Amino acid sequence: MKFTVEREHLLKPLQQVSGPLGGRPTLPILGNLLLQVADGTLSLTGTDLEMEMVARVALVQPHEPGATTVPARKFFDICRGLPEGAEIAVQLEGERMLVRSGRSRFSLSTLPAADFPNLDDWQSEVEFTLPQATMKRLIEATQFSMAHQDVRYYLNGMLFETEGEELRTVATDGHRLAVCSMPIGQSLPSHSVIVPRKGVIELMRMLDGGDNPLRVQIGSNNIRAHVGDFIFTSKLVDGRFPDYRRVLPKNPDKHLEAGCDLLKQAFARAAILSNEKFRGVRLYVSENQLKITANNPEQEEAEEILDVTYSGAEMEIGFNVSYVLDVLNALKCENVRMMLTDSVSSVQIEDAASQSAAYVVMPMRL
Amino acid sequence: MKFTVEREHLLKPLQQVSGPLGGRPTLPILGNLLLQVADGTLSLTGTDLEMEMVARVALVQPHEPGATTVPARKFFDICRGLPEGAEIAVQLEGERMLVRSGRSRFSLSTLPAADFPNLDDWQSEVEFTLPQATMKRLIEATQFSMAHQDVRYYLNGMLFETEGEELRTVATDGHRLAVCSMPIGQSLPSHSVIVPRKGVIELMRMLDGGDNPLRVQIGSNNIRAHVGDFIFTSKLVDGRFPDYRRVLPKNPDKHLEAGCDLLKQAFARAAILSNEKFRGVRLYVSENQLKITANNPEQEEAEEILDVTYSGAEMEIGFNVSYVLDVLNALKCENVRMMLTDSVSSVQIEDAASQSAAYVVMPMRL
Amino acid sequence: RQIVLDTETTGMNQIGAHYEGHKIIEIGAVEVVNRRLTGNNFHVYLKPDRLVDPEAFGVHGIADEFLLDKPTFAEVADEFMDYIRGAELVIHNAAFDIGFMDYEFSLLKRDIPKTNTFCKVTDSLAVARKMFPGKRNSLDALCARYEIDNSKRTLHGALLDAQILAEVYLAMTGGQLSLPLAMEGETIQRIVRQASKLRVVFATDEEIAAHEARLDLVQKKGGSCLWRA
Amino acid sequence: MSEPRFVHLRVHSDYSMIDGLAKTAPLVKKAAALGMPALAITDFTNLCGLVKFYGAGHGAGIKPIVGADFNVQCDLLGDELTHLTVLAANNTGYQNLTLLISKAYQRGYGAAGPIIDRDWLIELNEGLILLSGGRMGDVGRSLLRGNSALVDECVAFYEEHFPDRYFLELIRTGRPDEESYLHAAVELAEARGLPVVATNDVRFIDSSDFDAHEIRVAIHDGFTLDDPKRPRNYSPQQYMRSEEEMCELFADIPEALANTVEIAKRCNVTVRLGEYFLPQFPTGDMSTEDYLVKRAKEGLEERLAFLFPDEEERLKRRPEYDERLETELQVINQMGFPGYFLIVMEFIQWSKDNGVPVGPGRGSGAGSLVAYALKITDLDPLEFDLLFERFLNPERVSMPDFDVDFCMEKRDQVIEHVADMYGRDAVSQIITFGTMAAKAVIRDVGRVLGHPYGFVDRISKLIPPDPGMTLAKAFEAEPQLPEIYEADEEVKALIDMARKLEGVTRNAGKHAGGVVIAPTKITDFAPLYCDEEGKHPVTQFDKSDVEYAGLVKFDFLGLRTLTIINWALEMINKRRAKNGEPPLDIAAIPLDDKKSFDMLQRSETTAVFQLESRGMKDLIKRLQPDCFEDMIALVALFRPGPLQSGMVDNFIDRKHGREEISYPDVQWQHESLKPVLEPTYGIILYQEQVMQIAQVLSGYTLGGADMLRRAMGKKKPEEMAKQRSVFAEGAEKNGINAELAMKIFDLVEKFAGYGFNKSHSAAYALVSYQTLWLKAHYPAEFMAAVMTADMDNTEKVVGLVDECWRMGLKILPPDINSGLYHFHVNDDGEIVYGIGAIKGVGEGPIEAIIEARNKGGYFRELFDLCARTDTKKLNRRVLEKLIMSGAFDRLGPHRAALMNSLGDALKAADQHAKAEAIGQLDLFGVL
Amino acid sequence: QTEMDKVNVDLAAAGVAFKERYNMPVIAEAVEREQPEHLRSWFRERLIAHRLASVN
DNA sequence: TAGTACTAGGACGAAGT
DNA sequence: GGAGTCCTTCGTCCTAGTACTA
Fold it and tell me: Among residues B198, B224, B247, which one ends one of the domains?
């Protein structure tokens, strides 16, 4: 085998495949790249045993097909270091890959392609497309609610639920919940499935700044996403998860709105004097007004008072402000609305412009 | 106790006086910020047990003295968090500090001023002016050479020597070093101050890049520095910085030129395939050329072929890529000229436009 | 030119003379010139004159019969001595080798002297101990410290360690040299020899009496007092 | 007088434990061999070998001169670490010295050692003489810096508060800055008019001990010979240079030498040793004497009612007890020990009222009926004629050894009660310096010198386990030592040096081995050392030394066995309410139980104390002891003497009518010795029998009896010969034949060398009987207790189960739900493991487990367990053992499936516990 | 140089020799697998010339 | 706005054949 | 003056607590 590639085509893929690689992944082969020339293209790959990234790229200059396994992290970092428009000279001969670029010269650790865990081929079940920019909304509107480590494995990842023509997603840890949905414009079967944390990181990663169509195909127990020439593969898990319609509070009777930015800045401020581990505060609400106060073990005490649209009596309740500030960052609006039940049940929230991401977060017992 | 100040007037002082903060300060009130109204000005104080940062801000409304010390990062963020032109009104009622902003209210944990040590006022020896800009390059150009943790504690810091009509600074690891010399326009008596790394960190941060001129006073074992509105004060480490002229190389007879960006690029690239800790790269110089390689533990090999102007004798020499990249990252200039003596001496390294500075690593023989 | 070895043999005596009843079998002959790896080995082997020690076997697993017909120490004593003559001998486990080297030179019975008379004897562990006092200064220890592969190389010792130990040696001497500061290294043996008015503060008549009474107690309770002798 | 004008004034023994060398006596023998009349020992921040110092000074006609070095903090240098060397002139200084030391230790410290505040020189002021601190003082550091204002501030203080009681320390030993310091100090000496005095800062006998001392320090420090970072603060010239050597060394500085004469005059400290300093408060409202007599009669009343519940027999047997009572009373009162007993007896009563079963030793205290009457001892000495005049002899007005120890189980409780009683500072515990084994000293030398782990350990693991093993002994016991000596040059250098190191004190006593009391602050008489927090104070004198200083001792014996008993008793008396079996008091057991003797005859006596030896179990089997006296004998039997004189087989034969009973010998016998020798079937066994028969046969005093027995321990020719004459005419006085008497006296002499202390044997044999009763009477129930005792030892654990198995005693594998701290038996459920029976695990985790099990019921699964208890207490390592063991088996069914959900369970605990702690609810529900 | 790989197989096949003094551990079945094809021929004869001679 | 590097502390084994 | 008594060392691997940079 031999190949030649154009830095700028291949640099972005390199960054795509390069990001997920853990400081130390489990099995050394996972530290190297899949380099296969099949037909007229190279496919580059890194895996964590649960996810996989592929980029397919046109080779304009002479080549012959083949297979190898070469060091990923350092390779990408080298390619960051390359000059604009770089012409690269690389070649398989037996158990060495020779890497030259321009007049620079390199000699590599090289393993066979077959020593790398070649991930699984499977049959498509459902296929569909969407804009990249809508997906980023869906993701970024929901991503932070996943736990870092929940052993209820069905928490660590993002739920995709397909029924009728709508695809609906959600993330949560028991303490926050966020949902985001847009319709796909095609009548689908039913497939619902949740993606692993690290899988979803990479999916985010591949949402480059383009309006180019993003396509994903789901199998029975695995999923693939094509966005043009940027390619994604991950297996899925059985993933029994709860029905989110049992998690939704049905109709919390009292309603509340308030201005997002004012809200957010005030939260920002008041939040700092809640204990950082508990994020503890009490919210007292009255007609046309909200009063915010806290204190922590350090015996710092807080108060913020502001303009809120609210009709009804007082209420007493407290939250993790990180959780809400994260929604407020995502929340791209002037007005948001809370629709409340009580201190021992959910609080539902909805963006006065979103109508797609509603939020229910648990408070404290004071 | 009274005063009134605007958000915009508090913001930058607060960030700057918030510099010394961190490291789980052992004497708890060191983790707090001192509010003092004294004479015609509001003074804030933060210490890290070795240094102090003072801010002077205009008190235009009526005020009265009285002072206390409130928890620092949290407190800085509150003030930073308020909107443009905000009503900030604080008042000491003995033991408690009550802080308000308009209709919002803030009541803090409060430790009295007298738990915070106030460090001794000291006597000046030498006093001077120059642009901040000059001082920014000066510190930045040597910062990286100071060790983070060395047992030779005196190297965790920077030698300031003023001499003749030149301001002359220098720092080191015990491995590598940069020294720099700038003309100041007036007579300076001979002086030495050795400032701990924390100190120079703080000094770096107080360069906000203004054209506000920089004026500084230095005592025997203390220091004073004025940037625009702000005034810095610290004590230093007592002694044992050796004579830097001792380590200076002895008339390097070999000259070496290569384009700075190019040069920098090749180094960056090459760094990635060396020993993780030791960054081992190999240099063979010859008429019109240099041979660059590194070998790393994973049997990997890089080599860069390059644009080298060279007149002098042929020799072999290798040294730690990280340390030299640090100088190359500081030298955003036209050319580097390197001046060599032999394969077993310290080497001199230069911007080909400024001999104001000198950079140096000794080699390892690998 | 600087030449080293750690040598694998017909096992060891664990007590006293670790060398007694043993002779050398293996030659990987390191040539390292200006701290660069030539790999210029003379590769033929020697006579065991005995069967394998059980300890030695478990460390490396070698067995006698491969190394028996290959010529003895006497046939390449001079060939190999010329290979090592006029050199720096920085070596690990010095007590073992030097013991053997010098000893084998005399055992030829051509009166060929001990190696320390024509070669510079240096222990590598002494220098390792100097650099890393109270750390493990072993081959595998420092191997892992300087990140060299002895995980894909099962042999302990010499047909591998030659190469490796060179890299180790280089690391230790090629660790990084130091910035000539002005420093004064303690262990300078001097005495003042002076005279000038100073005050002597004497004990009182009563203090003397307390002492004389104390010595009474020494003498009378003890049966003698050497002040009162 | 004829020659001496000099002594060395800064000198340290090895007992400092950061510095010094060898022993103090050899140092003193050299000072004497140098023709010195006096000498100052200034051990580092202690005078621990002052006992031995006095002993040596007194003995050799040398005046002991008192001093020490310290860790100084003046606020002018901050916490820059310096010395002060501080010497006492007289009684006043001695007290102040002792207090200063104690105050430094009371304050607490780290690796830098105890530090004193300079301003403690306020209190500790009068009667003291002080130094510059030498080269590295507060004065020395300030002089080396050359800041004259800083210097003036420091000196001024000492010139003010210590006028004519401040001399300057000088050292020229070829070390850095000795010239510079000395030169600047002689300028200060002119300038301030303060007196100068010369020392050699001595730490050793011979200049070749340098290496050893260097290593001594490095042993503490933990660094290697060739390490540049390692402190090398000392030179080899610091030895006892002679009179004339020192005269010419300082023939440039005359006043320095003359100030040794001056200082020697000033230093005369009186501490009385070898006779008692009164440690007793009056305990009740009475005279000291009378309170004793009273509580003796009242203690007697308990024992009487217990021993003789038939009132007819009480009266018949009574006279002997009243007579013994009064006999002992008279001697205790006349010798002046009743204060001691009052404390102890109140203490013993108090420990019974609290849950403190009685510590195992009594020494030979069973010789005292008084001790017994006051409940100081456990079983009846007049039933078996047990003898006081071993325990205190009137014609030996010396050591009254009361020979008491106490139980570890309740240690802090006791220490605490006696601090509540006397005052925490009136009282202290004692150094138990961990004994420097041949192992240790070799080990440590070797690593410091940079021999490999393997090299040096190959040498030390050959050395037998003996505590008194020396290099002299090592060479003769093991032929491999001469071998490696001749076969390694660096081992020769090692052993020449290691001969000087052999048996030096290793470092601070980790924790005590006893306690003492004074009438006032203990520090008025003895100094302290204290633990890493400056707490749990220990006396600077060890066992031998502290009591030779005249102060009161009580030794350690932590017999896990009393804890067994305690625990077994509690658990047996729980079986009270379970089946109406009354509260059982170990003192109140019947002494004739045949179940007990049946099981004994079956040789099932493992973990019965001192019947742990294999040979001893063989001996039980052969001996077939069928009365209590045979059982007392067993410890005296299983020894080198009795086995190598055929004594075992003699007694065995003589016991069962295989050989005739004689009083004592086949040829040389007398029936008037039958009362003495009845229980041993004519076999001459005890120290008690010795003295009985001297008194009974030949009209001796009981104190004359003790004198003979002591003389036969020493085996002196003179001692025998005199008493051998009075022994002959004493027999003749009572009509008993001369030749018979003297030929039995030869047999006495033979067996006197082996002659065992009955009272000491019996006190410990008591305990074996107790372990036996509990075993046999309810041995299965005790078995729990047996296993409790040996938790940490795997070997014994396994042995013990095999012992249960043989007994028929169905041992069950564990259950976490039913398990207690340690072993339990349900009524039906014969046996259950203790929870402590889990292999590695520490105490905090196990309390956690059970605490959770208390609040909840039995934990339903894995899950329910983890939830109830916080993660602090649940480590994965803990839980890994739990899976491995199968502690869960009953609840968590699978072997493998449970290991898998272990991570899950941990995580659930973090997730569910931690959220509840934070205070935030989740929304899952429905499992 | 290439007989220097081949004659190191004479060295590895000597492992099986010390079976004939099993006073401390020597594993006969391990060498079947560790030794690849280019040396099986030399290795198999090496076993037998070794095993009888490590006895004497 | 998220992820890893360093230190702490106990547990287990030791320079080379 | 005779006799009986105490604990252990250091470095590296694995996981959790609190900091820093892209």
Answer: B247
